[PDB]
Every structure is written in structure tokens, then in C-alpha cells.
Design a protein around this ligand. Structure first.
Ligand code: FAD
Ligand code: FAD
Ligand code: FAD
Ligand code: FAD
Ligand code: FK4
Ligand code: FK4
Lengths: 372, 71, 372, 372, 372, 71, 71, 71
């Protein structure tokens, strides 16, 4: 039991912190993150030439550093959705041929992947997917709409979860990598939404899309469990972004409360302000430790789902409180867009919905506690 | 079987037997599977390999019992 | 002690509820609210031909109705800032000639007023205003910047609070009505800010503005107390808007939770959702009663400052929680702009800052409780 | 709509405030409350010679006054359980003969009543009562255990809710007044419990108790709805006690924070303390208004269940926060029994359980909001 | 960075968990904890024959285990006050002769120490101590009252903090070990207080107590900083008790919610109950990680005060919520003393006061964040 | 009848008919009664008097329909 | 005067006298004015009219004392 | 010295000089000491040893300046 980072891990973290300043869809910044190595952090060299094959802790520490120094949270979020919800299930469940075909360009960001499971009637409950996949010889025909696809408009591939056998319920779904050029894909314009402007969100329709069976991830019927495994990656690693974003919020509030004066004292001298900041620091230390613990536990081959769900919940909830408290501390200036504070709340409110709402995280926690 | 009725279904489903289609009727899902797998580990010493979680074995209590025997 | 509205008050409330559907700066909607009578509700007929001269309770009930039916909260906010922070101090402290000159067009909205006290270094603490007013014969020369003026760009008059005597501290400020055409006024473009888009917010600079002494409100030195009296009006009546907006949030969440299904039940069947809605209903009943109590008490000529500060605090805090909970209940759809839900949080976060932050309301409450 | 008390109501409230100082089971204080008129407040003169026949608002205002001035909350609670859960259903559903027989001594407190519905397996869910009542000619035979009976040990009568017809479910229960001298009643010793020491809590067993049918309240099968009506009285009026108790907590914290000094200032000068007190004042104004509103609405013959459940919830939750915050404000002195502060939290934690837990109040609110 | 306990640390933890079942002032249980090694965990063998000389992490892990298995929290608290507030400053600042004289019997619990700093007018602010120590040759004469001394009645020694030079302010106090047999000590009876019944709390008066200068800890004037160092030990290690106590609360709630049924389902099936338990699990994982982090950091010779204050705050606040939520989950049964649940809230409310209130922890956090 | 299935029972009970014993099976309880009474008021203009809430009228949909007609 | 020192200034300002400029030094402000006006009402039975709150009367303790006498 | 006035005392104490008794007047306390020690570390590269925190060195700015020089 220790909280010490290796010299190498510290170096990588400092490298991530410095990279932030070097920064329609911000394609140039996406490619810059590609060159930095963001999309290749957890990809083995075996599958991508400059894939770092980092362990989970090193990977989350670098992501945290980027979440701290890169103010475009939405962009980091797009990148993490691509890496953890798409590249990782490909790595874990793709044939060797699919992995060599897809991972090199995923790893550099030259090609972009989007995760597609939610539908018009499937959100928190994904037990009954209206999107179907029918076997026809060596091919599957995919049919259905996916309603909130991050990276929908920019995606070169969709990881799509579809019902292959209604009667097998939970074990009746299958995962497929669907190339963008497959006839029958249409994508709506990017939604206008509260935050995370750099991460496109789109409706995607699959109208009798034919794909070769080698594009299936895992076996027929494994869809639900592969999706669970990809959410284990995403809920764990993607949320490292917001722990960094919260360190930034906190740093900004401390600076401001030490600089801004009202009636001849810094506002730091009012406990309504300073004790508010103290609680941002508390909730942040807590969320960061929970992340580190979930990432460590995920590396131990035990069921780490409880720790991951607790971390996702604590980070995303702390991030909403951080966004609100930063505005409070900054006053009217925080309400103004030029205050450069009000993106935290807009982005944070996304983080308690995507990857499973807070209510779903508590469902998972309750289940892992053994509650009937 | 007592287990599925008490822990998973609690109230009613007193018609439950070794032929009830567990997957098809939604009795076994992502959450109930976790509890079932823990019970199987506790009660029988068996940790079901990932390859073995499929519609053949989890069709019903009879087929599931068959898998636990094999293991 | 009763909670019964008269037949007339009920009728006016229903009239406000129906008016909502009949709806750069939305000048046409502003004028429609003018024709409805929004800017004349508390103005005596003596000063404006169709001024309603309603009592405080009737006035707040109509405003609540408008806050419920008019989705442009920002517009209502602009209108209430004009009425309660500007028209009321004019009514209460203007010479008879100033009142007859100004109120008829304020009351119809033909002319628009803005309240201007906050500066670069004066926000929560307004004890030391850098804006000065120097007496020169029958005129005052006003000099200084005002930093967050609601209606700044559209204002025909500014109610401006300025230091007339540094040595008299708290009793060394004076209120002035400054016509927009006064040489030496410049106004910055409307700020981009988190919410309340229809209510312009602007920097306003007064560069040696000369105005006749008949434009002073009250006596030299009364500025601080006239400002307190105008905040008593604004903190009480303007916040009626958000009680209506919260009834709308609640109605939308109940409808949605009864309609939206996940896994073959309405989401209303999950207590994480339904108990969340129950607490929105609780906090709303509470905030509404606190408003009614503050408005009633303000009509009694006792110190009603504690009740008003409690109401402002409870309404604005409930409104932030309502905005967040509405998003939670609606899921991704609430995060999307087309979900027509996410304006509540954006607007609510303004309401805990303007008219004195929540921290300042607690300062006032503590003072009225007799805390040293 | 007004918040004005009549001269008479004010006088009665002041009388209640003064009565507090004039104060095993504290039988002498019980009888003193009897002489004051506590148990007769809502009983018509028609049924008890000095019954006040007050309306609901007057009754709750007097109870609030007593909750403020009488430090034995547990005693007030015992008295209110007797009056609202027992005397009121007798008044509302007893035959004329039962009312003349029972109410005169209930009204003075000469006889004491206890309410008995909860069982070993019936608490929040009272749909399936194991206690049975079998008709035998002109008599009923009652059989079963009741598990948490307030006033169990001191009761002269039990209002007992029993299953008369399993197949009629919700409409298969009946209410009975069971005299203490009925052979077959046994009562366990008073439980040791966290608070409310003066209100006995006991297990009561009914072993083939025979009672005459004239002791039935209402008709066979009406038990569930009579119980709901008695909880409407109890949830509304009994909780007025704790609004008074919270005014006392608040008064004590203000006095203490203005008197106690740390490092040459009163602790009132720290916002961690003073803003904490401000929120006690806010939550108290809110809970009091919610009580007044529920009591007024209950007098209007509309469904007032939502308002009553909101009031019960808000009062009892505010009371728990008040108990905790009073300790915080008082420091070690609040932790010591001689600090005379720590009874609030002990008593408050009872108030979120009895008369339906907070979770059940939210169930009722959700239902009255129309949530499916 | 890892969260792995060594085989030895795991073994010790399991030993602590098993020891719980083997259990006026409970002197026999105190001595049993002595034999287990509780008072010797952090004492080097150099100073006490069976002193374990464990590192901080191992020590806190064992204490956590005891807090989980020993239901007498008050007893553990007494023991930790003795060890961390008394034995550790003796170890760190006593002469070699004082250490050999005192530590062997402190380490076994044969002699008991009490920490004494708080006074009638010194609680959260200890800058101005009314207790004085006057040098007279080779002796000091101590004069003053100490108001809330844990272990006051049972103490064989008091660690007493006294003003030696008013003009040196913060650096004008000194620490002394005062033997109980010193003429001039009087001790009041144990206070009746809300919780922690097994930990005596007493007023202690020092009426011209003469002690030899070799009983001074450190140098004249070092009193404030030695006290800070002892609170660093106590705030860090003593609170490990309550993390164990919270694991017990959580285990009890999970068992109960899986066993207790209302209307033919376990109460675990209501999200009002299960999501409440999920949040107890979240807050507990968080508080435990914060403890581990503070203990690790304390072993690194950096300023670990921020981490310790965050841990103390998070643990003690989580413990209050745990006590309240355990009652809620258990219903009336949790309110009854036989429910064996309601000691958590009673004890928890102590934990947010002693070792510095939550408000003081936030003062320290704010200071370590660099807030002015 | 569509009402009881959709609003009160939501999922399943697709066997529900004019003979299903509403009280006996727990379909009508303190909470569902409130929603049913509001529906009856909205859909039929009928406010069921207190005297009329009893096991005879609320036995099933047929008997309840009979009460609403009488009223 | 004891009042201003204890209630309004608490710690120190032990130099305070009947000549200390209350407005100029920020001693009397929107919050302290409320407490002072309540004290004046309690201690002297005098409710200062609005017209009378001005820099002439509130200059210092002497001038304030003069106003309370007049009233 | 600018530091103590701005960071530690903020408003006023514009009479502060190299002779102001820092300990005696309560200017240096457990909290302000932390900020001062951090400033000294940042501004001068000096980490004051524990032995050296005493009333001789922290009497005033002059004596403190003397300690930082020695170190
Ligand atoms: C910014 C953003 C990006 C997204 N990106 C993607 C993407 O790339 N790919 C993708 O497939 N999806 C994506 N989504 C969809 C997202 O995963 C869902 O919004 C989320 O799962 C909730 O589903 P929903 O919106 O349908 O809400 P619903 O599931 O309709 O939920 C509405 C409310 O009911 C509650 N509720 C539902 N079920 C339960 C239950 N069992 N217990 C308690 N409460 C419950 C919810 O917690 C919520 O409060 C994204 C969403 C957002 C906001
Ligand atoms: C949408 C909007 C419209 C506005 N419209 C107008 C207008 O029409 N006219 C106008 O003059 N002004 C207007 N304002 C300005 C507004 O009144 C101020 O923003 C508000 O008074 C807070 O001042 P500030 O922004 O300078 O924050 P600051 O006063 O710098 O406060 C920053 C933080 O410090 C805290 N703080 C400050 N003093 C204390 C204290 N004594 N105790 C505890 N905490 C304290 C605050 O609560 C806040 O958390 C508007 C602001 C907004 C957001
Ligand atoms: C001081 C005191 C005095 C009392 N006096 C009396 C009296 O005079 N007469 C009398 O008959 N009874 C009395 N009671 C019993 C009291 O009414 C019950 O304790 C209460 O109804 C809760 O029942 P329970 O204790 O069995 O808890 P349970 O019903 O077992 O509940 C345990 C937990 O599960 C939750 N839960 C249960 N059902 C639901 C649901 N549908 N949705 C969400 N959550 C749920 C509860 O809210 C609680 O958190 C008293 C209790 C106390 C503490
Ligand atoms: C069970 C128990 C055991 C104890 N054991 C010991 C012992 O063994 N030895 C010992 O010496 N003492 C002991 N104490 C005393 C304990 O350390 C104090 O109670 C604590 O420091 C608070 O001091 P106080 O009670 O005087 O409250 P006060 O200091 O009077 O505080 C009252 C309120 O004012 C607030 N307040 C005070 N100063 C500030 C500030 N600067 N900022 C914000 N808020 C502030 C506090 O947080 C609190 O809310 C014990 C107390 C308890 C309850
Ligand atoms: P089990 O396999 O562990 O399933 C768990 C339960 C039953 C809770 C299941 O219903 C579930 O996980 N629901 C939540 C669904 C979820 O997490 N949806 C997220 C879609 S992808 C996401 O939003 C996103 C953003 C960026 C990339 N992906
Ligand atoms: P006292 O006269 O009662 O003064 C009270 C205190 C000392 C708290 C004072 O500092 C104060 O009231 N501060 C808050 C300032 C405030 O309310 N500022 C609001 C400016 S106007 C506003 O924001 C707005 C929006 C629309 C129209 N006006």
C-alpha cells in the first residue's frame, strides 16, 4: 500500500501537463492529441507501432494530466470515448486480423471510432435492443437507429450492439464493428447540447447494412458482456479527464479568492467562500483516490465493477458540484463566458448521464454489495 | 432453484421449475447473473469460465445444473 | 391566516397563465408584455394611465403565472429588473415632476430602465463606490464605470448609485436617474453569458456626465438606503418568476416520468426518479410559501428584510436544484437543447448571484436574527 | 391570502408559551397538560365539557407554542398521539354512544389512548395485518401482537387495526377501540430507545380478546381508510410540536453564538457558524409555513394529503438537521447532557420514522403528484 | 502506487477482526486491549518490551479492524486518545529518562494517560491558555482548569498544555506530563454525555501543582507545536476506529435490507433504501482511502496536515451520515436500544467535535491550500 | 379496464378482465385507489362518495362499472 | 457607547469615544445600523424616523446621543 | 515585510515595521506561520529548521530577517 508514482509515471504526468498549452470539430487538436499518444496509451506495440501499452494506472494518470491542462474537455471526452469504448473492445474481442487491420489507425487517431448502443427506447435499460442483426451466409444484415452517438458525425467505424436472438434475452446480443462506408448508414447533424461542444453527438441509422462476419466482436450472443466490459474501461478511465478538470477548477478558485477583494479583504477571508473551497478540495482528493483505487483494482483480475461504479459516480457528482461552486466563488464573472469558468458545470452535467446515469451506478453498486 | 425463487424473484413465480426459460423470460440479466454466479461459487465451489456463459447453459435450471456438474 | 386567493386574483393568475402562449433583444415580446400590463402592475393610476396599482401579493401572483407560462425567463427577468429596481425607487423617491415625467413610459415599457450599482471593485460590497457625483450649481457631474448592467444596451434611463461624500461612508452615496442621451455614456456589447440570453448584460461607462439635480432620487446621501429599498422590491418580487419556472420544470418531469419507459415500466416506478421528483415538489411548495409570506409581510410595514432574504435564497437555491434534477429526470434528452429543459439550470445559476449572492442573503438573514 | 393571527389566536399562543415553565411516566405533567386543555383542543363541547372545539389552525398554533416552551418533547408527543391518532378517529367514526362514553375522559387526559397498527411484519406496509378480528354474534374476538405502541403501558384504550376479511385486501380491515381491562391483553415493559423517553413505547399482545361490536369504529372493512384519516390528523397536527422545538433550538443557538467567544470574538463572527444558523432559520420558516398551509388546507375539504405529507417530511427532516446543527454550534457543551441541547437530535430521529417514514411520505407525495 | 496489504499486514488485520468477539469504566476490556497490543502498536521495542514499533499504515489498519469488530467504540476512543495524544508526544519530545520511565506502562495500558488542553474559554482557539506554568528553580508550578479531559477520571498522567510566557503568544506555551498523584489535582465526576460512554470525560483542576522540570515535554515555548504534532497523530490514527465502525454499520444495513420484508419483497428492492445504502458504501470507500492516503503521507516527511485534516473531516462526517442512515434503514428497530444500531449516531456526533471541530478542519485545509 | 392495465399495472397482467378480483389480488390499494378515483372523476364525471368505497363495489371491474353507472 | 464597542466592534477599538467618526471609519454600515437602531429602540424607547438617518446625526456618539434626546 | 502586511494582515496595520512584536500582537500564529514559512522557502530558498522556530527569532521582522540571513 503506497501512493508513490515512479519517476517515469511522474515524467509522463508532467509531459501531459505541459501538452495542454500546445492546443466545427477541432480536427487539428484531435491530430495533435494523436501525435502526443492519447489514443495509443493502452494499445500494445504488437498492434500499433507507437502504441504505448501502458498499464491502467499510468494511462489514467496521463489522462488526468491532460484533463487538467487541456481546457477543451469535450475534445478529451471524444478521444476517450473512441479509445475506451471502441479501441479496447476491439483489442479484447476482435479476431487477430481485425486487430491488425483496425488498431494501427485507431491508435494514432487517423481513423475515429464511435460507440453505438443507446436507442429511442433503450437508454439506462439496454436489455431490449430494437437494432437487429440477421445472419446471411458469411454476412450480417444490421437494421436500426442509434440515438446518441458520441463522434457519430466523424466516425470511421461504429461499434454497434444489436439483437441477434430475442429469445436468448441478455445473452442474445452481439457486437459488430461497422465501417462508415457501409451502404445504408445515415447520420444526423451534430446535436446542439448543453456542453462538450467538441464531442459530436448524433443520431445514426443503419438501414439494412451488410457487413462481413469477420467484423463481429466476440461470438454471437456475447454483446451484453462485451458492452459491460467496454463500460468497465470507459467508466474507469474516461472519468480521469474530470478529476484533472476539477484540479483546474480548484486552482482557479484559490487564485481568485486570494486576489479578488470585497471591502478591503480578499474574499478568501469569508468562510462562506473559503469553506466552500475547502470542500472542493476534499471532494477532489476523494474522487482522485477512488479513481486510483478503481484503476489499480481493474489491474488485479477481481470483480472491480463496484470500485469503478463508485469512482464514476463520485467523480461525475464532484464535477457537477465543482462547476457550480466555481461559479459561486467567481460571482458574475463566473457567469460570463469570458470568466472561463462556466464550461465546468455545462460539461459536468453530461458526465452524470453518459456511461450510465448516477442512478445506474448506484444500481450496480447495490448489486455488488449483494443487495437483493 | 430455491435460490432463484427467493433471492432473484422473491415474491411469487411459484410456478418456477427446472424448465422455466431463464433468459427468455428475463429472469437472468446482467444484475441477477452476478448474484447467481456468486451463489454458484459459494454453494458449489464452481467459478463459471467466461466461455461457458451462453444461451445453451443458461437456458433453464436443468441446463445450468448440467454445466455446474460438468465443472 | 389563510391561503385563499380572491376570485379577482385567481382570474388575473389564469390570465397570466394564458398569456405565455401568445409569445437580438426580443423587442416585440417586451412590447407584448407591456400591453399585458407587466411593467405597470405595481404603478398607481395617478402616475400611469393603465398602471394597475396592484398590491404586492397580487403583483407577485401574476408574475409567478408569467414565470410558469412564458418560457423566456431572461425576458421576464429584464422586465422585472426594470420594474422593481428602477420604476419602484422612482415611484418611492422621485420628485412629483420626475414621477409624472418618467413613469408613464416606464409603465408601458415604451421606455426601459436599467439599474446600475456594481463596479469593477464593488459587487457583494457596495460600501465603497468608485463612481462619483460632484455638485456644480444646479447639476451633478457623474463619473465612473458600472460593470454588470442588466438592460444596459437597451436602457433609456440608468438608475445609478454614486459616491457624493467619501467621509459620510454608508450615508455618503446618492441615487440618480441618468437619461441614455446624456453625453458621456458609452455601453459595451451585450456579454455572452451562461443563461438569460434575452436580458442584456453590459458594461456602462459615465464619462463626466452632467445631469440636472431634479434627476436625483431622494436627498444627497440617501443612496445606500434607497438601493436597499429597491433590493427589497427586487429580491421579493423579481424571484416570483422562478417559482413559476419551477412549477413548469416539475410539470415537465411528472409528464416525462409517466411517459418515458425503460424495461417495460415508466421511469416513475424507480424511486431514484420518483423520490427526486417528490423533493422538487417539496422544495417548490416551500419556496412558493416563502415568497407569499415575504410579499405579505412587505405589505405590513414591519422590517420584512429577513423574510425577503430567506425567500430570495430559498427560491434561487431551489431553482438551481430544479434545473439539475430536470436534466437528471430527462436523461440525454434533457442535455440536448431540443429537450427544452436545460435553460432552467443556465438561468438558475444567475439567480443565486444577482440581487445579492446566496452568501449575502445569509449575511442579511444572520443580521436580522440578531447575530453579532 | 394573509399570515395574520386573530387577537384570540395570538392570546392562546402566548398562553401556550407561558405554560411551558409551569412544568417513570410524568403523570403529574400529563395531568397539567390536561388541565391546560391540550387533549381537548379539537374536541367539540358537545362531547366533552371543556373541549375547546378549536379549528385546525388554532389547534396547531397552540401545539407549536407548547413545543416551543415545554422541553419535554416526548411528553407532548405522547399527548398528541393520544389526541390525533385516537381521540380524532373516535370523534369521526365512533357511534354517538361510544363518543359520549369515551371522549369526556380522553379530553381531559383522565383516560389515555394508544394507537396500535404496526406489527412484527407490518410497518411501512400495513396492507397485510396479522392481527385478526372474528365476528361472533354481537362481539368480536381479536387476536395478534402490535409491536411499537406509543403509550402502550399507560393506555386505558387501544385503537387497534385488525384484519376482518383477508380476501377484501385493502378494504378488509376494521378499527376497534379495545379497553385495557379486556382479558387477554398483555403489555411488555417500556422499550429503551434513543429519545422521547416520556412517551412509553411497548409491545402489546391481544390473546383472544373479546369485545362488544359497539367498540368498532366505522363499518367492517373501513379500517384502512379510518387509519389513513387518523394519520392525516397525526401527520398534520402532531408535528407542530417539532416546529416549536426548532424555534427553541434556533433561539438557543443565536444566544450562544452571541455569547460564546473564541479568540476575542463571538463565534457568531465566523460564517461557518453564523451561515449554519441562517440555514436553521430558513428551514424553520419553511417548515412552519408548510405546517400552516397543510393545516389550512385540511380545513378546506379538498384532498390535503400531499400538503400534509410534505409538511410531515419537511418538519421532521428540518428537526434532524436542527438537532445536529445545535450540537455543532454548542461544541462539547452541546454533546454533554447538561448542555440541554442533545435531546433535539435524539427526538428528531424518532420523528422521521413514526407516522410513516420519510420514504413513505415521499411515496404519498409522488402518488398525489400523479406519478405512476 | 498500489493498494495491496502485505501478508503480515493482512494477518494482523484478521487478528484485529477476530479480537472484537473476545470482549463503570470497562477496566477488564481495557486490559484485554492492552494484552492484544493496542496501546503499543506504534511504540518502538527500545522503549517498551512488547511495543510493536509498527509503521503508521500497519497501525491504522489494525485500529480499523478493531473499530469494525469491537462494538465498544467509546473504549477504543479512550485507548486511542491515550496512545496518540499522550504516548506519541512523550515518545517524540520526552527526555530519554522520561521515555524509559513512562512508556513501558503506557504501552501495556497499565498506566493510562489523558490529554488536557481545552479550557472554559479555550476550545477551537487554543492561542490563549488560562492555565499557567511558573518556573521555580528546578520545578514548575501549574495552575488552571482543563474542561473536557477524555480519560480524566482514570488518568495516571495528564499531558497538560500551559502558558509559560504570555508575550511570546503562539510560541509561549509548554507541554508537561503531570502525574495524577501530584498534590493539587482534583477531577469532577464523569460527564453524562450523548455517546462514547466508556470514554470518561471530566473537568480537571490544577491548583498550584508542583512538578519537576524533567516532566516538561520539549523546550519551554514549544507547547503549541507539540500539541499540533500530537493532533497530527490523533486526527490521523484515532479516526481509523470510525472507518471500521462504518464497515459494521454498512454490513448490518445490507443484511437487514436483504432480510427485512415489507409487502412480500425485501426492503432492498426499494431504491429509497438500496440507493441510501449505496451512498453509505461510497462515502465509506472514500473515507477509508483518505485515511490510507493520510497515513501514507504522514510516513513521507512532507507537510501531511492537509491530508490528515481532510481524512478527519471526511471520516467523522461520513460517520454521522452512517449513524443516521443505519437508523433510517432499520426503522423503529434502529430507534430502539436493542436494535444495536443507534450507538453509531451518538458516537459519531462526538467525532465531528473532538480533535478539532469540522469547522476547524476546514480552516486547516484552507490554510494548506494557500487561502489567505 | 385499459386504464388499470396501463396506469396501475403497467407491464403485463394481460390476463386482466372484468372478473379479476381487484382487492383480493392487491391491485387496488391505498395508492392505486387514489389514481383510480381521479380517473373516474376525469373520465366519467363521477366522484365516488365515501360510503360507496367497499368490497361489494370494488370487487372487480364489472362491479365497479356497475357503481359508476348507478352514480 | 459600551454597546458600539461590545456588540458592533467586539474586540479592541478601546480608543473609542464620543468623537470617533462612526460613518467615516466604517463603524456604522448597513448591517451595524440595524443592530444600533434595535438597541436604541430597546434601551431608549426611540424609533429613529427615516428622515433622521443622515450624516449630521450619525457622525459620532455625541451627535447620535443628541438626536436620541431630541426624540 | 510587504508580505506580512499584504498576505497576513491584508487590510490596514499600515503602522507595521521591523519592530512590531509579531508574536506578542498575535500576528504570527499557527496558520500565519505556515504561510510565512512557505513564503520564506519560496522567496529566499530557506527552510527554517524546527529548532529555530522560537521567540528569539520570531520576535519581529528584524530578528526574523536575522535568522534567514544566518541560514
Ligand atoms: C453527452 C452524452 C454523450 C453520450 N454518448 C453516447 C455514445 O457515444 N454512445 C451511446 O450509445 N450512448 C451515449 N449517450 C447516451 C447515454 O448513455 C444515456 O443518455 C444514458 O444511458 C441514460 O439513458 P437515457 O438518456 O435514455 O435516459 P433514461 O434511461 O430514459 O433515464 C431517465 C431517468 O430515469 C432514470 N432511470 C432509468 N432506469 C433506471 C433504474 N433502473 N433505476 C433508477 N433510475 C432509472 C435515469 O437514471 C434518469 O434519471 C450519451 C449521452 C450524453 C448526455
Ligand atoms: C445575470 C446577472 C445580472 C446582473 N445584473 C445587474 C444589474 O442590473 N445591476 C447591477 O448593478 N448589478 C448586476 N449584477 C451584478 C451582481 O449583483 C453581482 O454579480 C453580485 O452582487 C455579486 O458581486 P460580484 O460578481 O462582484 O462577486 P463578488 O462580490 O466578487 O463575490 C465573489 C464571491 O465572494 C463571496 N463574498 C463576497 N462578499 C462576501 C461576504 N461579506 N460574505 C460571504 N461571502 C462573500 C460571494 O458570495 C461570491 O461567492 C448582475 C449579475 C448577474 C450574474
Ligand atoms: C418513537 C416511535 C413511536 C412509534 N409509535 C407507534 C404507535 O403508537 N403506533 C404504531 O402502530 N406504530 C408506532 N411506531 C412504528 C412506526 O410507525 C414505524 O416504525 C414506521 O411505520 C416504519 O415501520 P418499520 O419500523 O417496521 O420499518 P420498515 O417498514 O421495516 O422500514 C425499514 C426501511 O425500509 C424503508 N421502506 C419500507 N417500505 C418502503 C417503500 N414502499 N418505499 C421506500 N422505502 C420503504 C423504510 O422507509 C425504512 O427506511 C413508532 C415508531 C417509533 C420509532
Ligand atoms: C467526546 C469529547 C471528548 C473530548 N476530549 C478532549 C480531551 O481529551 N482533551 C481536550 O483537551 N479536549 C477534549 N474535548 C474538547 C474538544 O476538543 C472541543 O470540544 C473542540 O475543540 C471544540 O471546542 P469547544 O467545545 O469549546 O467549542 P467552541 O470552540 O466554543 O466552538 C463552538 C462552535 O463555534 C465554531 N468555531 C469556533 N472557532 C471557529 C473558527 N475559527 N472558524 C469557524 N468556526 C469556529 C466551532 O466549529 C463550533 O461550531 C473533547 C470534546 C468531546 C465532545
Ligand atoms: P450488466 O451487463 O453489468 O448491465 C448493467 C445494467 C443492468 C445496469 C445495464 O442496464 C447498464 O449498464 N445500463 C447503463 C447503460 C450505459 O452505461 N450506457 C452507456 C452508453 S455508452 C456512453 O454513454 C458513452 C459515451 C461515450 C462513449 N460511450
Ligand atoms: P444594507 O443597506 O441592507 O446592505 C446590505 C449589505 C451590507 C449586505 C450590502 O453589501 C448588500 O446588499 N450587498 C449585496 C449587493 C446587491 O444586492 N447587489 C445587486 C445589484 S442589482 C442586481 O444584481 C440586479 C439584477 C437586476 C437588477 N438589479
Amino acid at each position: 500500500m503506497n501512493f508513490e508514482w515512479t519517476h517515469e509515471q511522474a515524467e509522463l504526468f508532467e509531459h501531459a501537463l505541459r501538452f495542454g498549452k500546445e492546443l466545427g470539430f477541432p480536427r487539428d487538436n484531435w491530430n495533435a492529441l494523436g501525435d502526443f499518444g492519447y489514443f495509443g496509451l493502452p494499445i500494445p506495440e504488437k498492434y500499433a507501432k507507437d502504441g504505448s501499452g501502458f498499464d491502467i494506472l499510468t494511462t489514467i494518470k496521463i489522462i488526468e494530466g491532460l484533463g487538467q491542462s487541456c481546457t477543451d474537455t469535450g475534445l478529451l471526452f471524444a478521444g476517450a470515448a473512441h479509445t475506451f469504448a471502441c479501441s479496447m473492445p476491439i483489442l479484447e474481442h476482435g479476431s487477430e486480423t481485425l486487430k491488425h487491420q483496425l488498431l494501427p489507425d485507431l491508435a494514432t487517431g487517423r481513423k475515429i471510432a464511435a460507440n453505438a448502443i443507446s436507442e429511442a427506447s433503450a437508454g439506462s435499460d439496454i436489455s431490449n435492443l430494437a437494432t437487429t442483426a440477421q445472419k446471411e451466409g458469411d454476412y450480417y444484415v444490421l437494421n436500426g437507429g442509434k440515438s446518441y452517438v458520441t463522434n457519430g458525425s466523424i466516425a470511421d467505424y461504429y461499434v454497434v450492439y444489436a439483437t441477434t436472438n430475442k429469445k436468448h434475452g441478455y445473452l442474445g446480443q452481439t457486437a459488430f464493428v461497422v465501417p462508415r462506408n457501409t451502404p445504408g448508414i445515415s447520420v444526423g447533424n451534430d446535436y446542439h447540447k448543453l456542453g462538450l461542444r467538441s464531442a459530436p453527438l448524433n443520431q445514426v441509422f443503419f438501414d439494412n447494412c451488410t457487413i462481413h462476419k469477420d467484423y463481429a466482436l466476440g461470438r454471437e450472443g456475447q454483446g451484453a458482456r462485451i458492452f459491460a466490459a467496454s463500460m468497465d474501461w470507459e467508466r474507469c478511465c474516461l472519468f480521469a479527464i474530470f478529476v484533472g478538470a476539477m484540479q483546474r477548477d480548484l486552482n482557479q478558485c484559490i487564485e481568485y479568492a486570494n486576489t479578488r477583494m470585497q471591502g478591503d479583504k480578499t474574499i478568501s477571508r469569508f468562510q462562506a467562500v473559503s469553506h466552500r473551497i475547502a470542500d472542493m478540495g476534499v471532494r477532489l482528493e476523494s474522487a482522485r483516490l477512488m479513481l486510483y483505487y478503481a484503476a489499480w483494482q481493474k489491474s488485479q483480475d477481481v470483480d472491480n465493477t463496484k470500485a469503478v461504479a463508485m469512482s464514476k459516480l463520485a467523480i461525475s457528482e464532484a464535477f457537477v458540484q465543482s462547476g457550480i461552486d466555481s461559479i459561486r466563488v467567481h460571482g458574475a464573472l463566473g457567469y460570463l463566458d469570458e470568466g472561463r469558468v462556466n464550461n465546468s458545470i455545462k460539461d459536468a452535467l453530461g458526465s452524470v448521464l453518459f456511461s450510465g446515469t448516477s442512478d445506474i451506478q448506484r444500481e450496480l453498486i447495490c448489486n455488488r454489495l449483494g443487495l437483493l | 432453484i430455491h435460490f432463484i425463487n427467493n433471492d432473484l424473484l422473491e415474491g411469487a413465480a411459484d410456478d418456477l421449475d427446472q424448465n422455466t426459460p431463464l433468459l427468455e423470460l428475463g429472469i437472468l440479466d446482467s444484475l441477477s447473473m452476478v448474484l447467481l454466479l456468486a451463489h454458484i461459487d459459494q454453494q458449489y465451489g464452481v467459478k463459471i469460465p467466461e466461455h461457458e456463459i451462453n444461451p445453451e447453459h443458461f437456458e433453464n435450471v436443468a441446463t445450468l445444473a448440467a454445466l455446474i456438474n460438468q465443472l
